[PDB]
Amino acid sequence: SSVERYIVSRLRDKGFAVIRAKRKDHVPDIIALKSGVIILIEVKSRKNGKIYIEKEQAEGIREFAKRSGGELFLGVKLPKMLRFIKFDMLRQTEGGNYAIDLETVEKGMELEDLVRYVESKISRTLDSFL
Amino acid sequence: SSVERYIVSRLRDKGFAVIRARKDHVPDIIALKSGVIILIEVKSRKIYIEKEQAEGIREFAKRSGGELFLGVKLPKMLRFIKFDMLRQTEGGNYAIDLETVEKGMELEDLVRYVESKISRTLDS
């Protein structure tokens, strides 16, 4: 929440059009737009050692992602750090939920990296070949 | 409020990812589909909007790179006109008469309009 809010602040400062917020569990926590690129972010707070995300919730925000056509990311706030990975990194567990090892998240990207990444996607949009 | 809910339901039945809710400067509706962004400021009823709110939601549109529209509920019809269609007033504000809105697009024309934007998405 405070983490989402803080993330919002940073995205706005970097020029993004950003918004937050019944069907709550299946709507990305953060929806950030900039120059025609859509980035969806689900933020979770975990304070220990594998990160698990519930099946129905994961498939739901995923369907919202496919509809919107936006790039969906998982943002995790560990005790001493904040990370983001592509939601596609979550593998479905035997039981049916989705998870990613905390190792991967730690090596994930920071806000500034998320941003650089988003910027390169904007450039992609404006690029032409030949 | 209900008009919003209506529009929202409608775009949802058409495959759009939709969300509602300065505060005045945010479009009432954000609808997303296949990488296309459509923002809609809802006005239920001559439409008039104060300089700063208009430039305000305009900046959001511009930052977003999205397509900003005015969703208007007239006594007996629902129309959609590009926000760009608002003309500046001598007082420095922005307005549009309902005649222009009337010839605007129906909910269904807006969807096809988006499909066209999506097609074009495939050439870049």
Left (φ > 0), alpha (ψ -120 to 50) or beta: where does B20 sit?
beta
Yes or no, beta carbons of B32 and A128 under 8 Å apart = no
Residue A91 contacts residue A74 (beta carbons within 8 Å): no
Residue B79 contacts residue B101 (beta carbons within 8 Å): yes
CA–CA dist A93, B118 (Å, integer): 35
Left (φ > 0), alpha (ψ -120 to 50) or beta: where does A11 sit?
alpha
SS3 content of chain A, % helix, strand, coil (to 5): 40, 30, 30
Q: What residues of chain A lie within 8 A of the CB of B19, using their CB?
A: 19, 21, 27, 31
Cβ burial of B94 (10 Å; 0-12, 13-18, 19+) is: buried
Identify how the structure was determined. Answer: X-ray
Residues 6+ apart with CB under 8 A from A26: A57, A60, A61, A63, A64
Yes or no, beta carbons of B65 and A128 under 8 Å apart = no
Q: To one decimal place, what's the resolution in Å?
A: 2.4
Q: How far from B103 is each of B10, B43, B73, B78, B108, CA to CA, in Å?
A: 20, 16, 13, 10, 14
Residue B20 contacts residue B4 (beta carbons within 8 Å): yes
Helix, strand or coil, per DSSP, at residue A102 = helix
Six-digit token pair at B80?
Answer: 């959609």
> Interface of chain B against chain A, CB under 8 Å?
15-17, 19, 21, 26, 30, 32-37, 60-61, 63-66, 124
Q: What residues of chain B lie within 8 A of the CB of A124, using their CB?
A: none
Buried-exposed string B17-36: b where 16+ CB fall within 10 A, e elsewhere: bbbbeeeeebbbbbbbbbbb
Helix, strand or coil, per DSSP, at residue A114 = helix
Yes or no, beta carbons of A34 and B60 under 8 Å apart = no
Domains of chain A and any CATH numbers: 1-130 (3.40.1350.10)
Six-digit token pair at A71?
Answer: 């790039």
- A-B contacts at Cβ under 8 angstroms: 60
Q: Which of B14, B59, B63, B121 to mutate to test the interface with A (most CBs of A within 10 A)?
A: B63
Q: What does the angle CA B86 – CA B58 – CA B63 come to, to the nearest 5 degrees?
A: 150
